[PDB]
Paper text:
In this work crystallization techniques were selected, tested and optimized for the lipid mesophase crystallization of the [name] membrane pigment-protein complex, known as the photosynthetic reaction center (RC). In this work, the photosynthetic reaction center of the purple bacteria Rhodobacter (Rba.) sphaeroides was crystallized using various crystallization techniques. This transmembrane pigment-protein complex consists of three subunits L, M and H, and ten electron-transfer cofactors, including bacterio­chloro­phylls, bacteriopheophytins, ubi­quinones, non-heme iron ions and carotenoid sphero­idene. It should be noted that the RC of Rba. sphaeroides is one of the most well studied membrane complexes. The Rba. sphaeroides RC is a prospective object for structural and functional studies of photosynthesis.
In order to have a ‘control and reference’ crystal structure without lipids we carried out RC crystallization by applying the detergent-based hanging-drop vapor-diffusion method utilizing conditions we used in earlier work. The resulting crystals were of sufficient quality to obtain a 2.1 Å crystal structure. This in surfo structure was used for comparison with in meso structures. To confirm the absence of carotenoid in the RC crystals obtained by lipid mesophase crystallization, we dissolved in meso crystals and in surfo crystals in detergent-containing buffer. B is strong and clearly visible like in our ‘control’ crystal structure obtained without lipids.
Residue numbers in the entry:
A (entry chain M): 1 to 302
B (entry chain L): 1 to 281
C (entry chain H): 11 to 250
The structure:
Amino acid sequence: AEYQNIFTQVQVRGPADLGMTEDVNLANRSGVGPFSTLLGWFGNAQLGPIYLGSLGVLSLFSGLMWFFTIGIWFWYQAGWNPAVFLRDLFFFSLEPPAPEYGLSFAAPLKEGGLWLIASFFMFVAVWSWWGRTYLRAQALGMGKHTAWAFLSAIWLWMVLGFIRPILMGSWSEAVPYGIFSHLDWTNNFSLVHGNLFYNPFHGLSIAFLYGSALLFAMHGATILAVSRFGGERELEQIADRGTAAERAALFWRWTMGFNATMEGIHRWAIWMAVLVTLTGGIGILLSGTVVDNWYVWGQNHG
Amino acid sequence: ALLSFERKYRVPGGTLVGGNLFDFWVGPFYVGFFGVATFFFAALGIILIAWSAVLQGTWNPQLISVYPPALEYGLGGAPLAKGGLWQIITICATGAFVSWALREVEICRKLGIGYHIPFAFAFAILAYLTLVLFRPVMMGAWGYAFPYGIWTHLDWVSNTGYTYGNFHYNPAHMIAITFFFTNALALALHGALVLSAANPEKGKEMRTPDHEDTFFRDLVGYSIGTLGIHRLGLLLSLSAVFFSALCMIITGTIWFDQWVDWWQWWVKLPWWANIPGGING
Amino acid sequence: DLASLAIYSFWIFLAGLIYYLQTENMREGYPLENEDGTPAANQGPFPLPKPKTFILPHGRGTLTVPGPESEDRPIALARTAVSEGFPHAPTGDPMKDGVGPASWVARRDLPELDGHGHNKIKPMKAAAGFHVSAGKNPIGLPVRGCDLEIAGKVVDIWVDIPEQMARFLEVELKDGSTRLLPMQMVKVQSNRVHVNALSSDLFAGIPTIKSPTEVTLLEEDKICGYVAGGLMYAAPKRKS
Ligand code: BCL
Ligand code: BCL
Ligand code: BCL
Ligand SMILES: CC[C@H]1c2cc3[nH]c4c(c3C)C(=O)[C@H](C(=O)OC)c4c3nc(cc4[nH]c(cc(n2)[C@@H]1C)c(C(C)=O)c4C)[C@@H](C)[C@@H]3CCC(=O)OC/C=C(\C)CCC[C@H](C)CCC[C@H](C)CCCC(C)C
Ligand SMILES: CC[C@H]1c2cc3[nH]c4c(c3C)C(=O)[C@H](C(=O)OC)c4c3nc(cc4[nH]c(cc(n2)[C@@H]1C)c(C(C)=O)c4C)[C@@H](C)[C@@H]3CCC(=O)OC/C=C(\C)CCC[C@H](C)CCC[C@H](C)CCCC(C)C
Ligand SMILES: COC(C)(C)C(=O)C/C=C(\C)CC/C=C(\C)CC/C=C(\C)CCCC/C(C)=C/CC[C@H](C)CC/C=C(\C)CCC=C(C)C
Ligand SMILES: CCCCCCCCCCCC[N+](C)(C)[O-]
Ligand SMILES: CCCCCCCCCCCC[N+](C)(C)[O-]
Ligand SMILES: CCCCCCCCCCCC[N+](C)(C)[O-]
Ligand SMILES: CCCCCCCCCCCC[N+](C)(C)[O-]
Ligand SMILES: CCCCCCCCCCCC[N+](C)(C)[O-]
Ligand SMILES: CCCCCCCCCCCC[N+](C)(C)[O-]
Ligand SMILES: [Fe+3]
Ligand SMILES: [K+]
Ligand code: NA
């Protein structure tokens, strides 16, 4: 049975790695957390340290407040009965205001006002988390690729809960907070707009979502297949190409007639994934603002 | 033409079938016995689609569609224009896919690399075969398989899902989706991380993997590391396709009612089924 | 119609993105070459991108790509046919000559450095604070090759300091010298380390390193290529 490098055979540990310093404010870094031998069978064993400046505390505070606002509504719906809470957990739902309230904030607490409070908390949590992704890269002198990619996911989120409701004229267009209820909303959105399978941006979003699994399967398998030549040390393979990077390239050249580089495959990777939510957010934003029925639109445009 | 570094790798050997008979290249493409096989299977399958197009009537890619035999034919043969062309094309497609995978294995052996890539491709093949072979056979008719047409196979997705209500409620389908979304999240992060290290702020030196671990520890308190992230991408993507095949092989076989109703087994558990209040009480 | 303009704009953006991505992935290995090393006539429809320069840390210099490609080493292979596209036969011992699946690249003959400027990979005995933390400790185990004969004994683990993982096993041979074995090419068992890639008689030919406490990128490529080469070239000695 040849070894396949899926699970580590021998873990080694040394002094806890406190990380690179560059321009990072070291006062705002925690200490290192525990070591997880469990994780170490697959990835790194070390937990922490984490950086928690003011923006991080704000974002984590909003995020929990958003989560707690939903959960307090769930407890109310459960009649404060813990057995009811666990039984119906996926069935509870904190729903936005009804259409009559439009974009107003006048809706009663139990009739959309609580949804608006939870959503406000979510807005602050996500955008301040976005600033964290920019600032932690800046402190380390690194490119801003993570923050730009994150902005692509934020795009779809902003469209679903904020931009599209505003353009449609009411908060009732937004997604409710609940496991089953937001699935119902998703199915309903498609029926009300004449089947999203006719939305060309929805079909592109699927191509890139399938494509992301294809590509990460390809790339993840390729790196493991050349990890016997240090393949996963990708930054140094970029700086000084080794036989790992050459064999990886030639597997794909010989298979499909073209190939990537150790750097360029990460540009395919970032764009494949980023275009999922980029095209997806366009497809949603166009739905009901400009196109009421994708079936009808397709009869006239192709 | 060869990549500048390529000639040293183009040595004899590694074939699984045929010795040195097909051990050669056509431009960039390696051939081998399974390259010949792939070409044969894919050529005939495309020929039959070009043919099965006119027995249907058209030559537009958005309308050509090779439908399988109607359910009345069961698991038996069917006249060419009435579903037999679909059956032969499906055999060709399986032949082309499996031959492609085995040609990948030969390429792996010649390059001295591990077999991870064709192993991963085999998951996609098995998902394909679940929809066109394993599920129809368990349900008793090729007609449950999907048609080969750009827009018609979407029709089949919609018709099949809505046979069971909102297909969102299939629990294996929920797991499959979680892996698809998480995989795309992991792909964005991985691509962005390596690139942010290799392309730092202007005039700065390339960062190291140490900076990569540090960025993610600063961000979320953990870094899976450069080996682990590639294990992860492979595992998330294969897991998604595994649960995709799983969510379909069980649908219309062991579960055939509306998937939303499956979740009653939880609601009707003895110790809370009849407590008043909430949504289901 | 706004949607129809958006989808038309998008396909144009996507064509430009694919052009950019493909040209970005030509910063290595291009221009294409004939089997004799001269520039090939057909380069494809994509032109080489404008060069970029990577600034390497710790005074290691820079890398500008695309740039003049050269193998910087002799390649002991010869044609087996009178036309293009056929395999090239090793002119000597391909494991010793480093061709085929035994190939190596002339990477820099310096060790990779961590972010502080220290050697990334060190023998564990020289790595302060580092120890086996889980799994079977291989140090002390006999090493068995694919001929089912014992080729030596593990005397240390070479560890990646900044990433905290095992990268090589240091194996001592019958004559008292050691070799590095890639960690991804050995199977640690309860009573042995088994190495499918190499027969016992080929362990002596594993390329040696110059310094006992560090390994250079060039040395790692020669070690890893050699061991992987045995999968093809040691098959006459691989039992079962
Ligand atoms: C997987 C679950 C469902 C299904 C659900 C959906 C849904 C829902 C959608 C698609 C979409 C598409 N699917 Mg489908 N699809 C299925 C099975 C298949 C099979 C197959 C042999 O099993 C194939 C080849 C395709 C192919 C396709 C494309 C026409 C399109 C974009 C996919 C993509 O980029 O993926 C990622 C892969 C890549 C990026 C790599 C490149 C792949 C190329 C584009 C495949 C082209 C195939 C060609 C058109 C037909 C065969 C050509 C032969 C030479 C004869 N589907 C099954 C039945 N598929 C989308 C669309 O727009 O449809 C109109 C869409 O919205
Ligand atoms: C019956 C249901 C309808 C339908 C209705 C919809 C609707 C409605 C939508 C989609 C959308 C999508 N659909 Mg569809 N869809 C159907 C059929 C399919 C089929 C199929 C095989 O049949 C497939 C493969 C897909 C696939 C897809 C995706 C390509 C796309 C979502 C991308 C994504 O990553 O979102 C997941 C990613 C996000 C939501 C981004 C989230 C970003 C934020 C910032 C994260 C916040 C985190 C928060 C703070 C919580 C923190 C947690 C703790 C930290 C742990 N659909 C049918 C026709 N589909 C979306 C789209 O783009 O359509 C164009 C969409 O809105
Ligand atoms: C109205 C429709 C229903 C519904 C009904 C269905 C049905 C029905 C099915 C799915 C399936 C899936 N659905 Mg659903 N689905 C809905 C809503 C969604 C939403 C959403 C956001 O609402 C999402 C994200 C999903 C997600 C998914 C995935 C879990 C899965 C598709 C991927 C897959 O199977 O790949 C597996 C990959 C393949 C099959 C590809 C195989 C490729 C082969 C091996 C090679 C092709 C080579 C090619 C021919 C080469 C061409 C030449 C080259 C291009 C040169 N569904 C709604 C509720 N869904 C499908 C599934 O699980 O299938 C198993 C399925 O059948
Ligand atoms: C480009 C498309 C893909 C994408 C990209 C993407 N997402 C990103 C990024 C990128 C590039 C980031 O950089 C960023 C990140 O940091 O990732 C690590 C992020 C991220 N994407 C996330 C989620 C996410 N992404 C998704 C999807 C995608 N992300 C796309 C497929 C999805 C879905 C629905 O598919 C989700 C759910 C987060 C992990 C992170 C953004 C984090 C954020 O905004 O956080 C703000 C909230 C908080 C800081 C706190 C929230 C508190 C929690 C609700 C927990 C409550 C439980 C806790 C245990 C409470 C205790 C209670 C008990 C006592 C009961
Ligand atoms: C398992 C994880 C993901 C995965 C992995 C994966 N796919 C892979 C690999 C891997 C690891 C490869 O190595 C291999 C490859 O070479 O990629 C470049 C491949 C590949 N995955 C591909 C496609 C693909 N993968 C997909 C999905 C996935 N691939 C998963 C999400 C999808 C979809 C729909 O999600 C598609 C379309 C190809 C690019 C390639 C395999 C190419 C191949 O087999 O070539 C030989 C066959 C031909 C050249 C043509 C055969 C033609 C047929 C005889 C006739 C047509 C029949 C067909 C049923 C018609 C369908 C019509 C449609 C409109 C429905
Ligand atoms: C044990 O119980 C306790 C109390 C401990 C708990 O805490 C239990 C907690 C729970 C049970 C939590 C349960 C939470 C869920 C089930 C969450 C489910 C949420 C989803 C499935 C989200 C789906 C999509 C959500 C979207 C798309 C949100 C979009 C948000 C908007 C973009 C934000 C827009 C902002 C607005 C409208 C406010 C505008 C006002 C301004 C001032 C700007
Ligand atoms: C995404 C996984 C999140 C894991 C979070 C781990 C945080 C580690 C911080 C622990 C702090 C240790 N100490 C001693 C300072 O308390
Ligand atoms: C928050 C405390 C910070 C350091 C604690 C480290 C915990 C590591 C525990 C040893 C791991 C070995 N074990 C027993 C899990 O196998
Ligand atoms: C902390 C929340 C920040 C304000 C944004 C959301 C406004 C909440 C509106 C709730 C409505 C309350 N009231 C009295 C009108 O019923
Ligand atoms: C960065 C990777 C580029 C891959 C591009 C994939 C193109 C898939 C085309 C699917 C067609 C979708 N649609 C809506 C037109 O039907
Ligand atoms: C765009 C989705 C499907 C694309 C079809 C396959 C792309 C062709 C890539 C093969 C090119 C190999 N080539 C020409 C260099 O030899
Ligand atoms: C969507 C993925 C397919 C994109 C096709 C990319 C270009 C393939 C042809 C590259 C040519 C290789 N060549 C001959 C220049 O070496
Ligand atoms: Fe990578
Ligand atoms: K030590
Ligand atoms: Na050359």
